[PDB]
Amino acid sequence: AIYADNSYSIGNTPLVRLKHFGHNGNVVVKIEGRNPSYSVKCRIGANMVWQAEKDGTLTKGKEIVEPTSGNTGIALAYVAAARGYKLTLTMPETMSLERKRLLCGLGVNLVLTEGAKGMKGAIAKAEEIVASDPSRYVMLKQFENPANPQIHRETTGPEIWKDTDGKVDVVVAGVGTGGSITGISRAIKLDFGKQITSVAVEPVESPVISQTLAGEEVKPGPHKIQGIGAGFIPKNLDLSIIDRVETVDSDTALATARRLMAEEGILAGISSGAAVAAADRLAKLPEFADKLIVVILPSASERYLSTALF
Amino acid sequence: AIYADNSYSIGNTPLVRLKHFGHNGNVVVKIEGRNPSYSVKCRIGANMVWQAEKDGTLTKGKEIVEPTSGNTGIALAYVAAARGYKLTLTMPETMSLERKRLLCGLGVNLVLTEGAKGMKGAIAKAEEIVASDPSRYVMLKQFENPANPQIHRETTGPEIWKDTDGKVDVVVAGVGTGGSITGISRAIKLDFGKQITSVAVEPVESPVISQTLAGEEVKPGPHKIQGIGAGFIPKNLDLSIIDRVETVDSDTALATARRLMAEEGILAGISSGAAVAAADRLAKLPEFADKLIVVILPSASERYLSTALF
Fold this sequence. Notes:
Two copies of one chain form a homodimer.
Chain A: E1 2-3, E2 15-17, E3 27-31, H1 42-54, E4 63-66, H2 71-83, E5 87-92, H3 97-105, E6 109-113, H4 118-132, E7 137-138, H5 147-163, E8 168-174, H6 179-191, E9 197-203, H7 208-213, E10 244-248, H8 250-264, H9 270-283, E11 292-297
Parallel strand pairs in A: 3-11, 4-5, 4-7, 5-6, 8-9, 8-11, 9-10
Antiparallel strand pairs in A: 2-3
């Protein structure tokens, strides 16, 4: 069990039972902060590169371009370093000094777009750079690349099945790209044949999934739950496998993450707090009190030292 | 495989083969950054509490006091939160705002001693607080508590044995408390019966182990390799199992950690760079070129964002 590079070391993350949430230990958390670049995104960083290799879209000498600076940026950085690709991340110039340092530490060519243009600015500049030499550059496109949900169907989902001896009844996951809830749901429902409850979590401030499913007007909004609530339905969210959508507000997500830290001794990020607050609500409805709820904790606390978490 | 609390989730950390160090992949690294509070110290945080419980020195209602603010502080914080102990960490007032936040986030009662007194200040204030109500307070004493090396003999060492199919020939570990190299060495040498080379790593700036073994004057000095080079021989370093001592300088340790990041896609801390630089030196001596070298990487990169690493 010696990994040929850090990308192969993804996953096999542990399940920890919560003591101050749920009812009689019915809430269990999967610690994705424990991964090579310390997030759930390590899985999709690995698999999107591996898949682009297998299909010939990524070869030696081609460069990677992606418009983000979040967990996926960090994940692609570690994989790119491990496997010998130059990586360019586009992002506004107004981004955190510390994220600049972390990504620069990881050997990323940083392209700081117009700050005023912001995120819009970066997506376009990605598209621009790729357009300039399409035989040289590849955008992996985390929101729509099937290799994203697929890695969750092959690793994250089976790990949950295994670790719970098939007892998992509910999976709660915040939605960013939708890959985690999609892949996990496909594994447990379709590969293992259990009719679990798949619960998507989104900020109450930007409840676009809830609005869409209700046939209401879609109204995205700003929030602090980093990693989720992109303000649209990503292609990698398979609405067909979602049984329930829970909304959580920023303050509750923050307070919940602090409780995870101070009361559970679990070093989780902001989205982790959101996912647990939603899980806790379900766990205290009599319909779910004899059911085993598994919650994805996407990242770790130290990535949030500059944020409202502290 | 559901852990009753986060303390039980320690270890089972992966081995990753380096590509830009050693010779023909003879250097393999054990990623301790992957643990509940993201350091090797999670193991000793867990076991020192468990052991003090088993022997009756720690009971419900007793409080924990320890004079550090490093990885052991963070480890004891997570375990204390998980298991329901109040924890007081002593430390100078001049400590990092970010470490204050991280530990305060973890629910630690912080006792900020005289800054001018510094570390000396904190050890005494620990002793003071314990003295004031010895039936209330327990100091676990990481430098001398046998539960420190013991957890490495029962977990870290066997994991290395298992993962390498007994092929490990050399273990390289930086020495802070000495627990890692001691416990690992005892496991592999005494429990599994293999005559490996145990290599302690210390800063060239503070080479007290090298000086002691040479019967030279012991001359501690300041350095930047955080986590190692305490400036004395800790009781938890069993000199009897050490075959070799390698010294590394701060700049080399830093540059090596940056290479781990940029060239290997491994997010390691400063001590990780020191341990790899020493391992690389041995790996390129013909006497070790057909030998499998395993290197402890004690911590992860984001804990060092405020430091010289970046």
